[PDB]
Amino acid sequence: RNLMIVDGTNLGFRFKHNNSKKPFASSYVSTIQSLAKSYSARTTIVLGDKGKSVFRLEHLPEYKGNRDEKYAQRTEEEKALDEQFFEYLKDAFELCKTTFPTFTIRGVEADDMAAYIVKLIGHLYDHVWLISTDGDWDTLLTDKVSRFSFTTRREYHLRDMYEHHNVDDVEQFISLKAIMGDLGDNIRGVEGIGAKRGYNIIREFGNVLDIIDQLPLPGKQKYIQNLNASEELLFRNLILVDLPTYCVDAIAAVGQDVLDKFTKDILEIAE
């Protein structure tokens, strides 16, 4: 028996992506049930995102700021379609509650919570299945923790780190994320360094922290020059993308009491 952890909001947008007019609350849940069969899920946990992340907002006030800009600029009609989807997702989350243990902790991202559950109880099962189309969840990948994306109908294991992410392991992936940056989340990275260039730097000098010890890096390239002057940026990004290391801190940002209750609830489920 395995454990299945669903990235609820993500799955929601997938349904929204398929059709932005149709109520999706039933299929949403039935989809999770068919899937639970498929992966011999003994325990299935659905998580949703409620509010911005307190942890990352503290370390970067402009965290996901662009996503607000995108809302401010939408027409009256698009903003309304947005609200439709959001009410439909809340509905989806309500119906879920009648079948699978569901969770929303305002100010806590689903990924920080997914990482906590895996940490907390991942060992009580044979395999853990992460249901998300978000590859950043791949920072949780191990030989007992795999991901499943609907947009591709694919499965992601650790062996697949390179083809899917341009790095060899979870730590290198975090390093790349910290060096490279993350456009969608509005995280600035070193100017002139992307997946391939970043990877070649990590493969030669190692993880971000190791690279910090080593600045100035030899190389007359401007992206290198840039790299040598981003010590601070790297420290910043690292805490923002290092999911497995900062997940607990991330849940406790909303309170030691909320952390304690999330814990009791998880363990009782995996019992």
User: For residue 50, how many other CB atoms are within 10 A of its CB?
Assistant: 16
CA 193 to CA 226: how far, in whole Å? 9
Q: Which tokens go with 32? A: 């999770």
CATH superfamily for 162-241 is 5' to 3' exonuclease, C-terminal subdomain (1.10.150.20)
Q: Please give the C-alpha separations between residue 86 and each of 26, 151, 172, 264, 267, in angstroms, as whole numbers.
A: 15, 20, 35, 29, 30
Q: Three-class SS of residue 42?
A: strand
- Which amino acid is it at 26? S
Total count of residues recorded for the chain: 271
- The values of phi and psi at residue 3, to 5°, are -120, 135
Q: CA–CA separation, 166 vs 169, rounded Å? A: 9
- Count the alpha carbons within 13 Å of 264 in the hemisphere toward its beta carbon: 6
* CB-count burial class (<10 Å; 0-12, 13-18, 19+) for 170: buried
Contact by Cβ (8 Å): 240, 187: yes
- Report d(CA 105, CA 187) in Å as an integer: 23
Residue 132 token pair: 């998300």
Could you give the count of Cα atoms lying within 13 Å of 116 in the half-sphere of its Cβ? Answer: 27
Structure tokens at 125: 């099962």
Within the chain, residue ranges assigned H as helices are: 8-18, 25-38, 54-59, 66-72, 76-96, 110-121, 161-165, 170-180, 195-205, 208-214, 222-228, 231-241, 243-252, 256-269
Name which CATH class applies to 1-160+242-271.
alpha beta
- 134: Cβ–Cβ under 8 A, 6 or more apart, which residues? 7, 10, 111
- Which resolution in angstroms does this entry have? 2.5
Sheet holding 102-103, edge to edge: 102-103, 41-47, 2-7, 128-131, 145-149, 154-156
Strand, helix or coil for residue 94: helix
Token pair, residue 244, equals: 């497995």
Please name which of 183, 152, 220, 211 lies closest in space to residue 64, comparing C-alpha atoms. 183
Residue 44 bridge partners (DSSP): 4
Residue type, 188: R
Separation between Cα atoms, residue 97 and residue 215, nearest integer Å: 51
Map residue 29 onto helix, strand or coil. helix
Q: Which residues are annotated as a binding site?
A: 64, 111, 134, 136, 182, 190, 193
Q: Catalytic amino acids?
A: 7, 49, 64, 67, 109, 112, 134, 136, 182, 185
Q: Residue type at 19?
A: N
Helices 76-96/25-38 angle, 10° precision: 50
Could you list the residues known to form a binding site for K(+), using ranges.
190, 193
- Compute CA distances 45 → 117, 142, 266, whole Å: 9, 19, 9
* Beta strands 145-149 and 154-156, pairing class: antiparallel
Question: What's the one-letter identity of residue 252?
Answer: A
Calpha distance 114→248 (Å, rounded): 11
Q: Which amino acid is at 88?
A: Y
Type of residue at 169? D
Which amino acid is located at 164 in the chain?
H
Domain locations in the chain as residue ranges: 1-160+242-271, 162-241
Q: Are 269 and 113 in contact (CB under 8 A)?
A: no
* Structure tokens belonging to residue 248: 């607990």
Binding residues for Mg(2+), by number, are 111, 134, 136, 182
